[PDB]
Amino acid sequence: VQIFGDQVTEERAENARLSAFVGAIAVGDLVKSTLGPKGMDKLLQSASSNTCMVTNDGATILKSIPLDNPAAKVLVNISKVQDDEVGDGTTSVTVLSAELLREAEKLIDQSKIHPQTIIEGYRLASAAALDALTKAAVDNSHDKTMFREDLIHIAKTTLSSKILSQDKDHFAELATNAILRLKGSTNLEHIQIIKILGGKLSDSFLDEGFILAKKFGNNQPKRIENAKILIANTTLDTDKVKIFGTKFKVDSTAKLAQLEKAEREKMKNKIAKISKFGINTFINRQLIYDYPEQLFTDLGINSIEHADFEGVERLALVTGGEVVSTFDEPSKCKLGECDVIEEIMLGEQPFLKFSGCKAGEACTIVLRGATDQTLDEAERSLHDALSVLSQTTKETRTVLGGGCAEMVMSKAVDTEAQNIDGKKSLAVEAFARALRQLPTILADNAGFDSSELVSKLRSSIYNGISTSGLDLNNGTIADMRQLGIVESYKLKRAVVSSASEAAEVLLRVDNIIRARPR
Template sequence: DKKFGVNQPKRLENANILVANTAMDTDKVKIFGARVKVDSTGKLAELEKAEREKMKQKVERIKAHGINCFVNRQLIYNWPEQLFSDAGICSIEHADFDGVERLALVTGAEITSTFDHPELVKLGHCDLIEEVIIGEDTLIRFSGVAAGKACTVVLRGATEQLLDEAERSLHDALAVLSQTVKFPKTTLGGGCAEMVMAKAVDQAAQNVAGKKAIAVDSFAKALRQLPTILADNAGLDSAELVSRLKNAVYSGMTNSGLDLLKPGGGITDMRELGVVEAYKLKHAVVSSASEAAELLLRVDNIIRAAPRRRERM
């Protein structure tokens, strides 16, 4: 929940951004190895005036960078916030550490803590900074950042469980998408790839005799379970749909898959529908499942260990 400072505009175009991690609450007059004692309110006022003057000088050094937006990881108290407002600089306080790191990355800025050499500080830039309200939360959105391709996804839900599930699903989808970008090879989705593999396994089973044929046939049935699970999760008649899909693929229509968006479900050409899956992910799933099944089949005996007994000293 972030906002601009008091009496500052809620929208800023062509922003030059200084991202900092510095104390803007108060600038104490530091006297090491000594204590300051006052015997009157006048002297206390002089001490406070000296501290305010130090903070004003710090703000002047920040203004010398030629910015119109100041983002600080720490708090910004009323006095420096007023100075920024008078200078026409928007200030954003208490940005969390992860947020500051990401903001510096996408805007092209560097996080700084000292302001004595403006020529050495790298500023960030973006086309638009504005306050937006989503539900009951006030957010600050940076648009047109220097990185060009950065974006933020806002997840909202009624409960923490729904949010956690949405976050996991989004993370999985982004992981699959990133792998697809790195390895652009894809397969057809909607159960098409599994049914085509099952067809190939069934054809290979015709040349296998004995108990091995049973294992090969079981592997084909396991592959056909994936489109069955897809139909069940969509609340459709899996037996009917998978039977129709098997008939279509085994008849030579190898691009056929389950169209779960059609009322009651249907069999459609997945290439025309644009339903694809990452080849690397599909290869990893089938390989891992096959290796796990092979590992279990290799178990030919179970050794039961006797319970551990404690020996009395």
């Protein structure tokens, strides 16, 4: 008795677990090459308008590619949350969560372990895993110079995976200065990344100011000094009063000539109130029409038009002033200050350069690269780099990487497996062996041995040296403190918790129900 309708695919047998497990293996193997510093970039061919996209992050790749498997959606969704939460470590969650299901496959088939036992071991194994990071962390909050050095090494670790592995020595100073500029503001929207194609990749810079994408309107000068900035959000152009039911009962056109004159008088009166501040620059988000633009010429005030609302927030914080409207009361209102303003040209589009501002609560980064795809990759990289360093301020604790983070978890996880005697020990050992594969694929991408190199890292830590790790440029074990690579505590806490809970999803599934497409 077929209770379901026509064209209803249902799998209530071993093929359901096989179809769900092979889907994660396909998603897992897709991202094995993108992990590590020697990883290869991937290429995406869009189906609409031939809009290509080059990206190394697994979140952008898996969201762009179509996948009809329900298991693929979990790997897509866990990567989207990791991309939005931290902004780094998405491929580690995808490859680790798939490897946990890969390691859990042989327990179901060969050893015939219950699914409730595998997850029960992962609960106790994940608990001991996070406890290893509790003692393995180090707080560098007592000294700002050491914390300044920590943001360097975290930038070295995050930027090495992208195409900027050579130029990370220069952008590490650029990345950490933007974080010290923001002085704790973890909002990534306060950094404008201006995209410019052409020039050498190392020609990027970080000017102490805010760079506009637009220019002056008609005749206002390029070079000035000692300018007072005033920002406004209201219309300031052909003022349509708040009630639209207004009308003019005109008995003669001569009186209507006075009414349009009265609209110019109040606008002339409004610009007269702007001059009471004694300013030299005025900025408004709405596009400025011709009539109020002309009155700024006699007053000696500059005018900038059509600024975006997200840029007004960046513009207010770099200038250090305040957005002013309802200009009758100039006493309570506040305005910013700047030393020099000058219009520049980087390529074809001109830009406005600000330098010497008082407040430095925000900045803008100008990238320079050969193509729009390399420039885009650069943006995706800096965004991932600045996202990790931004959360490092609120979460000062850090963890050493390079295979040492995954192994010190396995050292504590393997110790706890003996005190839980029974059939659960195989599940906890499967969680341990899943963690050994992260330094394995990191060695496979560089073209080194998978067994002997991991075996040397195994013996080095149990001897009583909790600072050993993999070094990929030479292919041998080296000290992590001397090389200077380290990750944040929130990152390693996130990928272990995300990959652990991701394994809990597709292990509690036995039946797959597919309704009709719409």
